[PDB]
Amino acid sequence: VRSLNSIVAVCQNMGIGKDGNLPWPPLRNEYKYFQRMTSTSHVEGKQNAVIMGKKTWFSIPEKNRPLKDRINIVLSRELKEAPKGAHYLSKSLDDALALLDSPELKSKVDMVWIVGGTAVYKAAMEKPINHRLFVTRILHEFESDTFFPEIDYKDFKLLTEYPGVPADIQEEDGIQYKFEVYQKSV
Ligand SMILES: NC(=O)c1ccc[n+]([C@@H]2O[C@H](COP(=O)([O-])OP(=O)(O)OC[C@H]3O[C@@H](n4cnc5c(N)ncnc54)[C@H](OP(=O)(O)O)[C@@H]3O)[C@@H](O)[C@H]2O)c1
Ligand SMILES: C[C@H](O)[C@H](O)C1=Nc2c(nc(N)[nH]c2=O)NC1
Ligand SMILES: [Ca+2]
Ligand SMILES: [Hg+2]
């Protein structure tokens, strides 16, 4: 795989979840941004792949599984088989990337997105491969029990602009947030 993509929404203390879900009530617009980004491939006949950890997979309402129009791969060292509705199950990010390269997929997959949680983002972050990080910064503090790993500001340079990412601070339900994109070039 040529380059990875990661997408996350974080709050002021870099928290990404609490009690198995998101720390804020629903942000319609933020959610549509995540959907659009992860779903949109730029090659007819291909779909994007999404990789996620176990807790994250189970965090999605059962009836909404798997993420429509994307190949859902879950990582777990415990499961023997793919949870009902996941497309594939993998033992490490490595196994995941290797799978992605296999012939069956290679031709079926455009973009690879990492959608968390902590350990997955971390793993993806340390891979010395080209990587773009789509972070949504919610300018408010909510109680969180889970957090986003530390971004190496030395490796990941913040772009000042990116095609199709609103520039200004957004507001919805009285909350302000901003879209950022960081890039690591290998
Ligand atoms: N705000 C956001 O953008 C965002 C994005 C994602 C998730 N969330 C939130 O974060 C929480 C879920 O995240 P989390 O970090 O706690 O859980 P997680 O990363 O989704 O899941 C943990 C499990 O996944 C498997 N796993 C994780 N990384 C692995 C690796 N490299 N290789 C193999 N298996 C690996 C392991 O399963 P086994 O124990 O079976 O080995 C590990 O116990 C929920 O609150 C969710 O709502 C928020
Ligand atoms: C996929 C599952 O909803 C997971 O919690 C994620 N949520 C979000 C995400 N990325 C953003 N920007 N927003 C979300 O709400 N990445 C993953
Ligand atoms: Ca476990
Ligand atoms: Hg927070």
UniProtKB/Swiss-Prot annotation:
Q: Which Gene3D superfamilies match?
A: Dihydrofolate Reductase, subunit A (3.40.430.10)
Q: What does this gene product do? A: Key enzyme in folate metabolism. Contributes to the de novo mitochondrial thymidylate biosynthesis pathway. Catalyzes an essential reaction for de novo glycine and purine synthesis, and for DNA precursor synthesis. May bind to mRNA.
**Keywords for this protein:** Methotrexate resistance, NADP, One-carbon metabolism, Oxidoreductase, RNA-binding
Q: Where is the DHFR domain?
A: 3-184
The pathway this protein participates in, as annotated, is:
Cofactor biosynthesis; tetrahydrofolate biosynthesis; 5,6,7,8-tetrahydrofolate from 7,8-dihydrofolate: step 1/1
One GO CC term on file: mitochondrion
Positions contributing to substrate binding: 30-35, 64, 70
> Biological process GO annotation list?
dihydrofolate metabolic process; folic acid metabolic process; one-carbon metabolic process; response to methotrexate; tetrahydrofolate biosynthetic process; tetrahydrofolate metabolic process
Q: Which gene encodes it?
A: DHFR
A GO molecular function assigned to this protein is: mRNA binding
Q: Which SUPFAM superfamilies match?
A: Dihydrofolate reductase-like
Which sites bind NADP(+)?
9, 15-21, 54-56, 76-78, 116-123
The answer to whether keyword Oxidoreductase applies is: yes
Q: What's the protein called, per UniProt?
A: Dihydrofolate reductase
